[PDB]
Amino acid sequence: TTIAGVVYKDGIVLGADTRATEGMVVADKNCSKIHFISPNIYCCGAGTAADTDMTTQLISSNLELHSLSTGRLPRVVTANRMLKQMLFRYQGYIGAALVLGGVDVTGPHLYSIYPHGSTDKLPYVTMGSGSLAAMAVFEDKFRPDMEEEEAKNLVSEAIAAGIFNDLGSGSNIDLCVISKNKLDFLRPYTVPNKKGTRLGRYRCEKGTTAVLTEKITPL
Amino acid sequence: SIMSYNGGAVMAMKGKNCVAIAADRRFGIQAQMVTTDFQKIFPMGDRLYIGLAGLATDVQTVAQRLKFRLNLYELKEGRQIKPYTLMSMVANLLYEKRFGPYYTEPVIAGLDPKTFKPFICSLDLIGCPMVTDDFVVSGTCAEQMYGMCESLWEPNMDPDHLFETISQAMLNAVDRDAVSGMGVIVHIIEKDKITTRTLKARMD
Amino acid sequence: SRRYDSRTTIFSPEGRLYQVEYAMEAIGHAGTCLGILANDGVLLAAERRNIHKLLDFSEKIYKLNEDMACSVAGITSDANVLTNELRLIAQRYLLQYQEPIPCEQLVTALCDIKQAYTQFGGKRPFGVSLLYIGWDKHYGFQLYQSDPSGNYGGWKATCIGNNSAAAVSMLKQDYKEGEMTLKSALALAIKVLNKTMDVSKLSAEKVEIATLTRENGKTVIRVLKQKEVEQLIKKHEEEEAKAER
Amino acid sequence: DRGVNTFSPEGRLFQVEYAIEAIKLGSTAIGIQTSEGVCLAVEKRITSPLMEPSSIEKIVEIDAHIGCAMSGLIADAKTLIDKARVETQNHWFTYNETMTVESVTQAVSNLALQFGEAMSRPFGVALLFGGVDEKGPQLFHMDPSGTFVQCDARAIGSASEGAQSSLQEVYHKSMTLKEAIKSSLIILKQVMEEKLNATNIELATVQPGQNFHMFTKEELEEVIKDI
Amino acid sequence: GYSFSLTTFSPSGKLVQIEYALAAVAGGAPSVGIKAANGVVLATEKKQKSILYDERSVHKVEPITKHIGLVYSGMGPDYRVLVHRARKLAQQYYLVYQEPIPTAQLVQRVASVMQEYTQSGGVRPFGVSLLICGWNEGRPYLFQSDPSGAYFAWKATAMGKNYVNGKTFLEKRYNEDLELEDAIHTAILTLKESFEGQMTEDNIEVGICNEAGFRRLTPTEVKDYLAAI
Amino acid sequence: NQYDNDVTVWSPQGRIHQIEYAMEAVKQGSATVGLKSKTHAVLVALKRAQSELAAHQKKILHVDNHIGISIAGLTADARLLCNFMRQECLDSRFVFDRPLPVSRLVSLIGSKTQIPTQRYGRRPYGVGLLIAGYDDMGPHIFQTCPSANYFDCRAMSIGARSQSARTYLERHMSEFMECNLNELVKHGLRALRETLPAEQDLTTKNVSIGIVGKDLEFTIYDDDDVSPFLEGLE
Amino acid sequence: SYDRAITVFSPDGHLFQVEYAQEAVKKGSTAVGVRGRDIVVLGVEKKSVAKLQDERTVRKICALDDNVCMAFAGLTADARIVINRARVECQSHRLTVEDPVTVEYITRYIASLKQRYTQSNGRRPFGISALIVGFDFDGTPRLYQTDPSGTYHAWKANAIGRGAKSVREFLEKNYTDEAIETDDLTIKLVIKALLEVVQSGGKNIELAVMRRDQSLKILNPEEIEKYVAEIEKEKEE
Amino acid sequence: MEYLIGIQGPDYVLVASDRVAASNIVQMKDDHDKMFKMSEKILLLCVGEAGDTVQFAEYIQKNVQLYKMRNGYELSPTAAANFTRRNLADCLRSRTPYHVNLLLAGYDEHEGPALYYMDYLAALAKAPFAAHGYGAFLTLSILDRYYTPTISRERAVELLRKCLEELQKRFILNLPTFSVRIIDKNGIHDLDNISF
Amino acid sequence: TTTLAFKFRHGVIVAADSRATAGAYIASQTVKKVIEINPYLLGTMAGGAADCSFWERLLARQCRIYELRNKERISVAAASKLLANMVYQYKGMGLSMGTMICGWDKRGPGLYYVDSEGNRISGATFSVGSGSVYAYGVMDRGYSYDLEVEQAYDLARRAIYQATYRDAYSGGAVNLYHVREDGWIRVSSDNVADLHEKYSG
Secondary structure: OEEEEEEOOOEEEEEEOOOEEEOOEEEEOOOOOEEEEEOOEEEEEEEOHHHHHHHHHHHHHHHHHHHHHHOOOOOHHHHHHHHHHHHHHOOOOOOEEEEEEEEEOOEEEEEEEOOOOOEEEOOEEEEEOOHHHHHHHHHHHOOOOOOHHHHHHHHHHHHHHHHHHOOOOOOOEEEEEEEOOOEEEEEEEEOOOOOOOOOOOOOOOOOOOOEEEEEEEEO | OOOOOOOOEEEEEEOOOOEEEEEEOOEEEOOEEEEOOOOOEEEOOOOEEEEOOEOHHHHHHHHHHHHHHHHHHHHHHOOOOOHHHHHHHHHHHHHOOOOOOOOEOOEEEEEOOOOOOEEEEEOOOOOOOEEOOOEEEEEOOHHHHHHHHHHHOOOOOOHHHHHHHHHHHHHHHHOOOOOOOOOEEEEEEOOOEEEEEEEOOOOO | OOOOOOOOOOOOOOOOOHHHHHHHHHHOOOOOEEEEEOOOEEEEEEEOOOOOOOEOOOOOEEEOOOOEEEEEEEOHHHHHHHHHHHHHHHHHHHHHHOOOOOHHHHHHHHHHHHHHHHHEOOOOOOOEEEEEEEOOOOOOOEEEEEOOOOOEEEEOEEEEOOOHHHHHHHHHHHOOOOOOOHHHHHHHHHHHHHHHOOOOOOOHHHEEEEEEEEEOOEEEEEEOOHHHHHHHHHHHHHHHHOOOO | OOOOOOEOOOOOEHHHHHHHHHHOOOOOEEEEEOOOOEEEEEEOOOOOOOEOHHHOOOEEEEEOOEEEEEEEOHHHHHHHHHHHHHHHHHHHHHHOOOOOHHHHHHHHHOOOOOOOOOOOOOOOEEEEEEEEEOOEEEEEEEOOOOOEEEEOEEEEOOOHHHHHHHHHHHOOOOOOHHHHHHHHHHHHHHHOOOOOOOOOEEEEEEOOOOOOEEOOHHHHHHHHOOO | OOOOEOOOEOOOOOEHHHHHHHHHHOOOOOEEEEEOOOOEEEEEEOOOOOOOOOOOOOOOOEEEEOOEEEEEEOOHHHHHHHHHHHHHHHHHHHHHHOOOOOHHHHHHHHHHHHHHOOOOEOOOOOOOEEEEEEEEOOEEEEEEEOOOOOEEEEOEEEEOOOHHHHHHHHHHOOOOOOOHHHHHHHHHHHHHOOOOOOOOOOOEEEEEEEOOEEEEOOHHHHHHHHHHO | OOOOOOOOOOOOOOOOHHHHHHHHHHOOOOOEEEEEOOOEEEEEEEOOOOOOOEOOOOOEEEEEOOEEEEEEEOHHHHHHHHHHHHHHHHHHHHHOOOOOOHHHHHHHHHHHHHHHHOOOOOOOOOEEEEEEEEEOOEEEEEEEOOOOOEEEEOEEEEOOOOHHHHHHHHHHHHHHHHOOHHHHHHHHHHHHHOOOOOOOOOOOOOEEEEEEEOOEEEEEEOHHHHHHHHOOOO | OOOOEOOOEOOOOOEHHHHHHHHHHOOOOOEEEEEOOOEEEEEEEOOOOOOOEOHHHHOOEEEOOOOEEEEEEEOHHHHHHHHHHHHHHHHHHHHHHOOOOOHHHHHHHHHHHHHOOOOOEOEOOOOEEEEEEEEOOOOOEEEEEEOOOOOEEEEOEEEEOOOHHHHHHHHHHHOOOHHHOOHHHHHHHHHHHHHOOOOOHHHHEEEEEEEOOOOOEEOOHHHHHHHHHHHHHHHHO | OOOEEEEEOOOOEEEEEEOOEEEOOEEEEOOOOOEEEEEOOEEEEEEEOOOHHHHHHHHHHHHHHHHHHHHOOOOOHHHHHHHHHHHHHHHHOOOOOOOEEEEEEEEEOOOEEEEEEEOOOOOEEEOOEEEEOOHHHHHHHHHHHHOOOOOOHHHHHHHHHHHHHHHHHHOOOOOOEEEEEEEEOOEEEEOOOEEO | OEEEEEEEOOEEEEEEOOOEEEOOEEEEOOOOOEEOOOOOEEEEOOEOHHHHHHHHHHHHHHHHHHHHHHOOOOOHHHHHHHHHHHHHHHOOOOOOEEEEEEEEEOOEEEEEEEEOOOOEEEOOEEEEEOOHHHHHHHHHHHOOOOOOHHHHHHHHHHHHHHHHHHOOOOOOEEEEEEEEOOEEEEEEEEEHHHHHHHHHO
16 A cells, blocks of 8 residues: 655645555455544554554544534644554554644644554655655655645655555555645546456346246335 | 355345345355355345355354344334444444454445445455445455456346346356355345345256 | 431331332323233223423334333333333343243343342332233233332233223223224223223324234234324214214 | 441440340250260240141251250351351361361351441350360350350250259269259250150250260150159 | 432322422523424523623533534533533444434433433432434434433423423414524524513524534624514 | 441540440450569459359460460450451561561551541440560560550559559559569569459469560460469468 | 341340331231142132233242242242242252252252341342242152241141131141041142132132142142032031 | 264154263273253254363253243254354353364254254254264265155164164274164154164 | 272272382382272272372362251262362363262262263273273173172282283282272282282292
């Protein structure tokens, strides 16, 4: 998998692919890996799928309760705190690696969280199996205070390099743009690959299959 | 492996205003047959079914606990369950036993009781939902079924062509698996009727 | 603190348990509930105490199983707890044996819980009384009744709630053993309810009727609609008007 | 209302006083200690000819060398008897030897005041222990307050006062076991309301060199023949 | 803690602490709830003892989820505890079924919580009564819950001081064809009856529930509605 | 009236009545005397019998090779306290392998006994104790009350009609530190005799003696063994 | 948990809660039990009989095991608990010892259970009294009686409930050696003893009989009517 | 290793099991009984690990008899099989697992005869004929070859004799004698032992 | 270790050796391997000595408590059942014990075999220990149910002697016991070094 995030002059851009495999066989071709946490906070997960799903759902509910009680928009530091404390409590048996990002009354914030409870605050981050192929692109072409479109192009290039150079990544590209005044959730953003057209006609005509028993249950 | 101790194969496919779910019929212990008419597809409503493949004890245990919970839910609420809600319920039930998991992988197929819009999905060992639009497979012969379904499935299938497609896919897939087969059972779920059929397959 | 303890679970100098009589006195003020057993089914009829015009399945009839139903009289808050416990008991039995529970086992299992509160714990008992109807492969159609103290017994026709004694006397007068059908049972229930309510004439909005029957190898629990109760009331009125001549 | 653990103004626990009051409603038991053995004799209150006398047992076997006679509330003595048996067996298991009568009495009486707010009230049963150990025949008395003593001749129950008064003149240190049996039977005959007829009484002895023994009908007839 | 029940049966079969709790409730501030074809409206009176108080510091109308709202009559401190528990219950239901909790299920869970305090050791019943509004399956709901644990479903209801006259007012001026704005006008008029002093946008609170969710009206909108009336 | 049923209720005058009633329980026991010299500590106890056919109750107990106690009041409470003391001495000898000092044992007894007199639904220990011990600092006589208060004495008497013995001891304190063992024993016997009614006398049946010393473990003399101490008296 | 002491001593050394339990028992329906030579008989009088009630659900003679059965008098809900405890104990004994229970063993267990409820915190005594009948492995019939205080005794014939004193007075005279020589005589004795209290004849009598190797048998109303008619014909002498 | 076989006909169930109790390389007993009676019309045959068999079987027997005594009517064969499966499955994942293989044979007055198979992982199957042991391999082919749904009692006993003679000829373990029983609407009948 | 027990018309007969070793070193040759539980029950030890001794003492105390409570003596089947249930709770811990329990009760003579794995079987002829396979041969060739008392004594002695002759961890002296209806008696303790001249000549 390949998940990436960048900070530009007004907000955050996050991106991910959509392939999910089981062993060496492609299971899902349209997986979703960008998770809602708060109207201003989002997360991209990698590792074991079930663990990331349950972790994000639990943290989202806790932040919902906290925001209802206080009456204010939540902060990225709060979500980072709860995530890292819960992950450290389990001593690394929850194989979730997370890229967390959001905009609050302090400005854009972007964190990376590891399965053992570590945390980094950085201006651009990548995770997954194809994390090195995208980090190459970020090291080559990153500048501070980019515009929206330049950051979107940069994230697309990083994710495309991860898709094309790694066997565990593929299919489409998803983008999420978080800004102070809006939130864009592009699904999908690019479709680099398409399925070839079938040449033959293998339609099975009626009466090809032999049947032993049959019963009809009228509802 | 533990998933291959008993064997088994189940699949679900989506048509136009209808769904189809199929499973094999064999209970054995490794390389020895014990019985033929083993049940792996259970009804969870008027137009909703779930199929379990994997280890037989876990198949039966999961089916019974799920029926327990579903009955209590329907008594409290006063309505029928929805396919999304059933998928979430099964994911919760499977994740509760993390680090001690049940060795099954369910497949859910049904129609929306309000709009009759098809729904098929599959969950993994520890409960990660994975909703598709074309077809889902589960069991020891997943590669064969993927190969057959990628080539035979086409959008907007009426009940007859859907039945023929799923029959051919299941038959040709389980003909290449040693510990699966010896009969195929097919359910066609439609708006106003349900059709159950048993296919003629090799018994060796 | 011994000063503020009220000594709920103790005997009295006459050998009585005052909290239980007080709970039973509380029950004798709730709405009337009636149960009748026939040859091909069983029925429950209950009085609706909610009659405000601004009020918006059924009010006092609950479904516990595929084969059973119950109705309560007393304090509804405790009835909710008891109903939620009955459902769980039935589901546990089905999970363990893969078969539906018989009626008498369910009644016994709840009455044990009811008695435990009266014997120890320092808490107050439940102030509700229940009527149970169901079908069972061992014995068929059955009807039961419970008490706050944990006492149950089977019947063929019974009544709990307000004005119970008059209804019981009327049932003793009019019920015929071994010759009842659903139609005659419905007529008898309508007659007894009309003779028990504190209204000049019965109305379709003040009563709810539930019927349990067995068709096509499956149990059906059906709540009668208003336009059927209206026809039943009209039939009773016509029969009464032509009764004396 | 007051608690279970309140002292009276003259420094006594009320519940123990009430239990001691309850003791004085039971049947009369009399025990005599001699250098040849120890003897225990107890009443039976047959309230109807339709009752079976043999179902009333007030003299039990704690162990092959220790016996007990009880009075008061009979149903409460079962717990004490059960504990006594268990402690004797535990002592044999650990040390491979027979317990002493005094040690059994201490172990039983350590449960007397273990109640509060588990037990909720005192026991209200009085016991006489008769045994033979390395020191010879011994008779012990234990009451609901938790105090136990050693005696030469004791009478407990409803008619304890007159029976003790008679035992004052009867007893002397050189008595034979046969004379002790006769004297105990005479006192029991005096204090009873019915007529002693070898069916409404119970008698047992413990002697060195042989186990705890319960008299049967024939021996009772033979001994009562002299009275 | 005391392990014995403080609520017991009276020789005539009455539970008296429940009657006393209802007496406490009947002395609280008025509340009105009206259900229309497009949504539900909840209104309450928010008179305060002095001008030094901050009028916007605490609210009586509160959201439980995106589609459920509460008002109360009784004691504020108990209302806060009940609100906290209702929020926690809704979050648990969402975590299990991945779906917002229906109104009729939340009312049942809250009613069971309120009943637990009537048959438990060393505690007293809650002294508040609750009005719940929600929107599910394309239709609105309106429920009332009592200190005993019994809940009812209403169309229009009034509670607190002088609630019998409020119920008569609602009975005489309610029909099933009202729109939401007519409902708001009727609710404000019902609050106007038996009001003390001159009412403004700062001493009443209004909340609405419709297809978009639950929201409490801002003081500018309350000013607009008061000017219209 | 209403201030005397619980141990957690203060009287309006700042007193706890249940403690006073526990005090009243002690003053109904038979008398006991304790006294010491530069080298020895002695306890003398008067025993009682219910009747002429019953043996006299024990009043001197073994606690450790250098510690003994004497009892007045409820018997079962005395047994509880004695077992607690024995366990504490055994624990000290196990961990540090030296005898436990007497004052540190009395502190533990007081700490244990104070707790019941503060909580709801509990009662004070209705037993009074006289403790005789010997350690590196010489002989020690301690006296304990049901109110968890303890005193360190030169000589002390407890039980019923014990004021006469206290007066005798107060008169004759000066000679104790110089007396040898026999004179100390006779002094204790005279003080104990001061409590008897004029129609009763001391006998080998109702007198028990317990002695501890510098090179002498705690020994108990009963029955004929107290005959040498009674010989030459008066 | 609730840890209050419910039953305590009073001046003159009485336990008032146990006395009030005795008072509760003395208001139940009468139960009579007779021990014959090869048969044991139990009989209960039905306090109230209605034509709208099912009898199978209100029976007061239960079967603890294949060889032990019992009848009770007092509060029905307490008996429903004691019976289900005794059943579990019987099954546990049969599992562990590989032998069916003795009548004395099970009555001792029930008595101990009933006594332990008059000395615990936060509990009130059981308000029931019991008659237990059975046959031992050697073929000896057994009749036992258990009290709410925890005491039990063996009897030749007995009666509990309301009006038990009058029935005991009748049995003191009419229980002889010749009156129990055959099953019919024993059954007639039980019926006649019950007739001293019950009204309206045999319509208010439930009768049960056990023999040496057979299970408990409930006698139908027709047999009761036949026996009552025979007893009535014996009055013509 | 022990051997169990069951055959299910139109109105009866026939079951058989061997009678050897072996420890190490020597036979300790030659009249061992592995057939527990749960009711007047239910038999439960158990093999497997030492100790677990008797504990599990006696627990099941106690619970079934208790159901009978409390309720006044007996459990049907299906409910007893489901109860057994649930109790084995629950203990599977705990600290005290049972290693037992089970056959359950019963008769119901409405549903007829019934035969159930259970392995040590607690998966329950319903079969017309079944076998446990190492002789199952040698015997199931003969049973498949010669069985018909309409077989009668004498023919069933003859078929069982064929199977046991095959075990005598081919199998390496010494199994001289077998105990045979039949379940019918009249209860459980003990047939003559088959010995070689 | 070798211990045997067989049942015949006049009761039960139990025989055992006396050697105990620790490795290849013979610790002692005076061990008493027939444990005297009661005046009416007998047990044997094989495997761990400490385990057998401890658990049979526990059994003896339970039997005495049962007799005190019920005024009747426990039976052989019940005693074996108690012993079987007390050792099933330590399954897998590492216990090692195998015992015959011998007695006489209302159903005649009784001889049960219980071991720590879980087996509990009744029988008419048992042998346990290392050298049991050597005692089966002689005992099976000579055993009959209609033996006389002296013939049964001789059979037991010969079987134990033949077992100790070819087994290396078996030897010492032969201790013999006879269980009758009125209790057990101790018959003899014969040294192997003298049985050798008695039998060979």
